Amino acid sequence: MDVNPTLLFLKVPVQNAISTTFPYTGDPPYSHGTGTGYTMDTVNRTHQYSEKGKWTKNTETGAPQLNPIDGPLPEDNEPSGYAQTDCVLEAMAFLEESHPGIFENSCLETMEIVQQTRVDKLTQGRQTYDWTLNRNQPAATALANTIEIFRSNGLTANESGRLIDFLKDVMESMDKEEMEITTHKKQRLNKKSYLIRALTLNTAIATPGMQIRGFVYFVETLARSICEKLEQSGLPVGGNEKKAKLANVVRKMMTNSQDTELSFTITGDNTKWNENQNPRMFLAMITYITRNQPEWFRNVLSIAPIMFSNKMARLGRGYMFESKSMKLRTQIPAEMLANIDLKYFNELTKKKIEKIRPLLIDGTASLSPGMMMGMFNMLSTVLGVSILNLGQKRYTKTTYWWDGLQSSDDFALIVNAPNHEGIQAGVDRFYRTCKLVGINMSKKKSYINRTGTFEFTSFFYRYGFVANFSMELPSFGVSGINESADMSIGVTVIKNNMINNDLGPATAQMALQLFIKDYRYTYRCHRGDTQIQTRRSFELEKLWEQTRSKAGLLVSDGGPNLYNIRNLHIPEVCLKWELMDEDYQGRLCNPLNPFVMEYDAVATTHS
Amino acid sequence: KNPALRMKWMMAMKYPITADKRIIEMIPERNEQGQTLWSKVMVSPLAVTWWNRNGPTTSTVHYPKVYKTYFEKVERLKHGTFGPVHFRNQVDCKIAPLMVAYMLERELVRKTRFLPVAGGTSSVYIEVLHLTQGTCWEQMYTPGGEVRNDDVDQSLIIAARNIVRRATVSADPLASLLEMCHSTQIGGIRMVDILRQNPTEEQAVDICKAAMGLRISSSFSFGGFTFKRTSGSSVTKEEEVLTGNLQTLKIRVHEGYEEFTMVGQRATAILRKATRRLIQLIVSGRNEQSIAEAIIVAMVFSQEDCMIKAVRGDLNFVNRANQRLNPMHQLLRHFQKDAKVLFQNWGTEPIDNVMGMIGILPDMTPSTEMSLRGVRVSKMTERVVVSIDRFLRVRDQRGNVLLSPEEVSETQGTEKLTITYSSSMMWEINGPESVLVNTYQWIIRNWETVKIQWSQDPTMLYNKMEFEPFQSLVPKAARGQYSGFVRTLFQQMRDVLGTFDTVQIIKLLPFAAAPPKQSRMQFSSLTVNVRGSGMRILIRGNSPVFNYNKATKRLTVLGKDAGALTEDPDEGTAGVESAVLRGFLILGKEDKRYGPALSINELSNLAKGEKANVLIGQGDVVLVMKRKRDSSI
Amino acid sequence: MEDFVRQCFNPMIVELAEKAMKEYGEDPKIETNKFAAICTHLEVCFMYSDFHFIDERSESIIVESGDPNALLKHRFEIIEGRDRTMAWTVVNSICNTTGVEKPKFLPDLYDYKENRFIEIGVTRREVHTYYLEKANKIKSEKTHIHIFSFTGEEMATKADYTLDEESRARIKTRLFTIRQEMATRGLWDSFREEKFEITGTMRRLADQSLPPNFSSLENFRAYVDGFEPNGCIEGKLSQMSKEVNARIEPFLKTTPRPLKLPDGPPCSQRSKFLLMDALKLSIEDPSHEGEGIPLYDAIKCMKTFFGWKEPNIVKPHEKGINPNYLLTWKQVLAELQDIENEEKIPKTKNMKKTSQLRWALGENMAPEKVDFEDCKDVSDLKQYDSDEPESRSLASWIQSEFNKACELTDSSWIELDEIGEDVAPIEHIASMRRNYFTAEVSHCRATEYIMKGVYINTALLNASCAAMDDFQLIPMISKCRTKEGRRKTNLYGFIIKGRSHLRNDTDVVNFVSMEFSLTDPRLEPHKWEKYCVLEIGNMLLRTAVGRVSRPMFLYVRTNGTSKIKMKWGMEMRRCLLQSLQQIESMIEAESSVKEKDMTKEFFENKSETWPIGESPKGVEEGSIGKVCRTLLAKSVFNSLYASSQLEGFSAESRKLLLIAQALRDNLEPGTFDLGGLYEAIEECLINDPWVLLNASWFNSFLAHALK
């Protein structure tokens, strides 16, 4: 025999054994795509998809800017960013018409959110770009540095603590004629230099600075409030709830799809999603959502697209040149790409550098034409849902009508029609109506098959059964805080992982076994019976001898584990209560210790 | 950061923990073995266990109040009540406010939750969501609320249910049930005594009572509901009927105007019948599904023509132990699996306004103008001698089955008082950590007969049923290879006159109750699986699973006690041990004259009659002599 | 402050209030009044909704016993405690079911009797002022506003109190109790337009960020505010070229095409330790556990072999340093001899830093860093990895590797710990599945690779952290429990670490790996491109005719790894969990379709088989005991041979696999661009042996499935 695991699919349907095809459960030990090359390539691609736009020069920043909106209509089945403002506005007007009051209610809720949110909410995030250091630092450090520099320059409204006051301070800073940055070094940035520093993204392959994040948060809050009311959207939800939507849509399109009405599902994927969405269009739709609203609300919500459309991008670390005849390894920083002779590089990199050189200003590269991944993730979904809403059979005025699900570059479209020509026309109307708004369907990553089976953001649906493989197995190891906290965390991980990320009972039990093994091997607390000889064994042995109710000992006191599925939500010290010896209870939980969702646990001598 | 590796490295170092500066005033500076506990403050982890071992005791009676939430959760779980695991296939205006409420709730479940789920939304259920529901299954689970404080009737019901559910699968149901009931005891009191005294009306308890010949109620149990007759009387015609798939069935049809009060666990009903027709039925339930199942059972019991032709599948059902059940139960189970066809084909007709009784749901949700036939939702005792059949089917003088092992619920409760199931065939109900204890206790309590049969008729002793549960624990892959090995050893205790150790027999006997397989391996430890962990029983020595204390002459199995052992007069005294190696006799202690010790893998190269030393166990060496005569079963 | 509201209210309200605080970014510790107000509002809403149920056409029920009833339903639908998206779903369902204007904001309740949404409030502020403020904020008729007060004052629109007087009295008593307790604690008395302009640089950037035609943000906003759908999509769809279309190419049984694997010299071995060509110098029953000192077992094992001969190079590296690979072994032997002569085991042997180790480790080959200014003229400078995707064709050695990795062994490599009792039936099913799996995979060579990798990476990371500037000799030990119950201590070879000043977790720590083995290099010289294979001994092996002497080889190579790789290898024990998840999902799908627990028809049924092989007879079917190991070996090899090509291929071939599944199911699959999909799949196949083998498996599948 020659073992061929793929041949297993000859017996079990693919969606049943789909887990076989996912190689890793964890972050691989390699970096897939990053560095100066993959950033310059992205810039060049974003500009290429909009090459037939209008070129201008930004008065303040002083960098070339490409404006494809209302550009020539596409002529071939290739990506194009030439979004049409009329088409997008009409689509959003129709979305409002089909869901009356959605925009008004969302705007009111977001407006209430704006006047309360504290600046602290801006530190609960991920790595952020420090305009004061040209580096990346965690959110809290970036916010603290920005606030310190703002105070040193006279801007102090952020002391109020509201995020909107911090935004007002940011806008005032954008108007100052010179910003003084004193680091634990004395430097002064003129208006243009600071403006560039605040309109830059470093290397989701890019993280926005601190000025942008404030407005991005509010824009995405409005986007989330809009999405929560759209059944088509599937971004704001997760876990079991998402599994409902899939079924729901298949039920909507198959209620009476039996009178010869052929139904077909397109499992799709939008090509170059981030490199075609135009921040100018996001402004064009935010100005529509925030209609007949207080001018301050529109002004605050319109400043994220305005800052993106002028955004610059830092290329990256740079290149590394190796001379194998001299055994030399030198590095070229990205800032020197504007003058270095184009002979060292290979042909493809040489072409990339040549194409990007005209856009290089102050070491960055203007990236007006398109958005970058990770930002405006929930506002893009609204455009997609609006497109999906244009197949309601009252907006097509024909016999074919589509309606499906979309989650920001992942969609499934159901195209009920009365015959195959109807299906082939309802797919073309979607692929064409969806090009006018700058969304490019990927023809090499999609497929259409009769309804009853498809894939949507790794939720494989087959004849009513949904397999959820979107999220990965969490690390089932000791947290590393202390003996008491680790048991509480590790067990809770398995519990809430079973609840949210569908995890089998048997695999849950084996994960618990592996966790107990790691726990006992970190803190030397093997079972009393077990003969492992560590430095802590002797004390654990004697304690085993003198305890009559050996079952009540904590797992950290050389006792027996008692955790199965039914009791993963109960803390150890409260699970093993009736089983403890009264003297042992007193000794463990004595307030005279010389020693003493997260970590929900009881305090004992172990802490 | 990677805090896990940091914590491992810290725990590696001595004195990693930071403690108060008063530790010297409380804990010593060195333990009984001289291992230092603290320095300068910095304390080794050994102090954290020294405090728990020898430290200032304190009263902790207040913690259940300080942490009342956690202990409330623990108490809710401890009194839990598990049902069966259900594997579910995922396949202006009038509008009265009550209709609004139904329509709404029925609409939310559609777009709110994916898995159908029966019911439960309060936090008492949400807290155990990781257990109740999964990808494609449900784990029906009644929370451990406060329901009475019997503490004796509950334990009796649990014991009776366990006995019936274990006997229904045995070779002879009635004999096994009588054996188990005559041996089990709850709260010290023997089970038969409480059975005689208790008046409880549980299905399993009533079956057990009928087994003893005691008198039980005349009520008729069916589909989990008790149809207490209230008026009328008739005869069973024992006729035949044909189904939708054209499968003839031999049923017992009734007649006459009969009034039946259907009591249940979570619903009640009043039914009138006359010759296979539902004249008038009233219901009063708790949940929508409770009422749904109540009417399903009532209609199945009505034996109506429309009900019978409503079948849309194969009426083939299997009881545990591969039995076919009865046609009435077949229909009930089929119509419990599927509901819509039965209800829609049952027929509908208009209602007349009556006090406090809404019309049934024709489907899904109730209605106030049209209801299914003669069914209306609403609100608001003698002993007859019986006889049990072989398949625990209680019957009356009329011959109509009253209680059967299918009426007993699957509700696996938790015993309140301590229930001891003395007898085999039930040591599996308790944890697998108890099967070993009970097996060894049984082997000891019957030591004389076991010894006689071992020395006379070993094969019948090996093929004994009392060792079957033990065979569940032993790994399947090596289940047989052990037997052969052990069997061979025992033969070498019957051939080599003078060698006889009781402890070895009582230790290795249960391992020799499987079809033997021959191999050339010299086992050092026989492994057995308990609670997912593979413990070992050493062939020569003491193990946590089996420790024999010579001083007190007592056997300890997994910490618990097994009993005491006497000494056979034939017990060998020369020290020669024969059942420790496949073809060798351990002639005594280390003998440096014969040379350095040989690993147990090398002694297989010794020729007949050769003698050498071998490392036979933990830092131990013994002299072994190869047997010239080779013995094998 | 922080204690009362915590204690007097049930926890659920506490978590709800904290969730609201996180929503607004607020912290419970920083503030008191907002938390107290939120908890009070939540409790008031719940006690209003928990008032009582409905009945048949009479409503206004006042029953409170605890027995649910079908015809008795809650009169008030909770909305405050419901999730945002789900709350909007509920309110939309209300509006669709019965005609009532959608409230601008999320209300608190939906009393069914009056069919009117109910918004409730409670605050110390003057009742009339609060009611007017709420009427202004929640500005809509056909709704209801109900305002309470701690002082004992209530109000509602139209003076039409919905519920009964007794329940209102209960609410007032609860409020009075709260206020009185708070006042007795010094808490009660503690409780007592927007402008944003775009000007200057932001105005000039907003006017510069519009659609081409427009000039100023004011003009753009004026246009947008006056937009009305006039059929703009229709005209532009009419004007757009007909070539912009997605024609559905049919996908038939003949369309599928075998993938095109690369062409070139055969692929070479890439792992970090010999997988199947591994030989162990194991000792039985080392003597009591306790993680025996690795360097003591590494000597007690090498004392078990007496066939050491003069090392001889049988296969050179052919682009490397052979003599210094030989001398590193001849120095390891000497160092191990010195440990024996010394008293007590050092517990860590730092190797003498000599030219042999420096060169073998590559420390003397690494290029020196130079600033670009100095090396401008050097003509050999080129972008690193300028072009080296050398394509290498598939070889059979990887298939043999997997074949041997799917086989049983005579040992027990994974010894898991215990679990609590199994009470719930679902617990019984889970335990049955887990026990069957662990029995089928405990004895297996995939588990041997898992544990060997875990041990090696752990002992390498620990030494790389502790001793950062020493060449520390590291044995490659593993421990198993033989089928007879006696523990062993296998030694596979040695690892010599190099300088390990790892600051960022991507710096490489070059190390020399020297494995023992019996597999002659000359049989597959193309598989050992990266190794320098020696001949170190002559081992006697039990052949059929007598006992034959066969050579014992040592495989030497200068490898390198970083903290990320070490951490990814130390967790290889997750391969068991991944494989168990795969098997259990396979069981769960079948059970769901079959409406019963298929845990038995899978594991205990000697007839069931799955096609997982291919022999000259045809497709070969194994038993569940072979699937459990095949999937485990597949996962272990995904972890060992992890690469970007593997991820790309697995992502891109799953779409083709699903199209094939749709075809086999007769769903009339159709693709918009299949050539692009095939090109994407074949772009990943370059030189990775594992991905090439996977592509070959895919070809074989397609061939058998669509035939």
Author numbering:
A (entry chain E): 1 to 184, 208 to 226, 240 to 632, 655 to 665
B (entry chain F): 41 to 80, 89 to 139, 195 to 483, 491 to 743
C (entry chain D): 1 to 192, 202 to 716
Give the article text.
FluPol, composed of the polymerase acidic (PA), polymerase basic 1 (PB1) and polymerase basic 2 (PB2) subunits, transcribes viral genes and replicates the vRNA in the nucleus of infected cells. Replication of avian IAVs in mammalian cells is hindered by species-specific variation in acidic nuclear phosphoprotein 32 (ANP32) proteins, which are essential for viral RNA genome replication. Here, we present cryo-electron microscopy structures of monomeric and dimeric avian H5N1 FluPolA with human ANP32B. All experiments presented in this study were carried out with H5N1 Tky05 FluPolA with the PB1 K577E and PA Q556R amino acid changes.
We next determined the structure of the Tky05 replication platform, comprising an asymmetric dimer of FluPolA and ANP32B, to a final resolution of 3.2 Å. In this complex, the active site of the FluPolR PAEndo domain is buried and thus cannot perform cleavage of capped host RNA, i.e. FluPolR is transcription incompetent. Its orientation is stabilised by the arrangement of the PB2-C domains: the PB2 mid-link (PB2Mid-link) and cap binding domain (PB2CBD) pack against the PB1 palm subdomain (PB1Palm) to form the product exit channel. In contrast, in FluPolE the PB2Lid flips over to mediate the stacking between PAEndo and PB2CBD via its C-terminal α-helix. To assume this configuration, PAEndo rotates by 70° so that its loop stacks against the PB2CBD domain, sandwiching the PB2Lid between the PAEndo α-helix and the PB2CBD domains. The interaction between FluPolR and FluPolE is predominantly mediated by their respective PB2 and PA subunits, forming a large interface. The PA-C domain and PB1 β-hairpin of FluPolE stack against the PB2N2 and PB2Mid-link domains of FluPolR, while the PB2627 domain of FluPolR interacts with the PA-C and the PB2627-NLS domains of FluPolE. However, in the replication platform, ANP32B interacts with the FluPolE PB2627domain, while we observe no direct contacts with FluPolR. Of note, the canonical mammalian adaptive residue PB2 K627 of FluPolE forms a salt bridge with ANP32B E151.
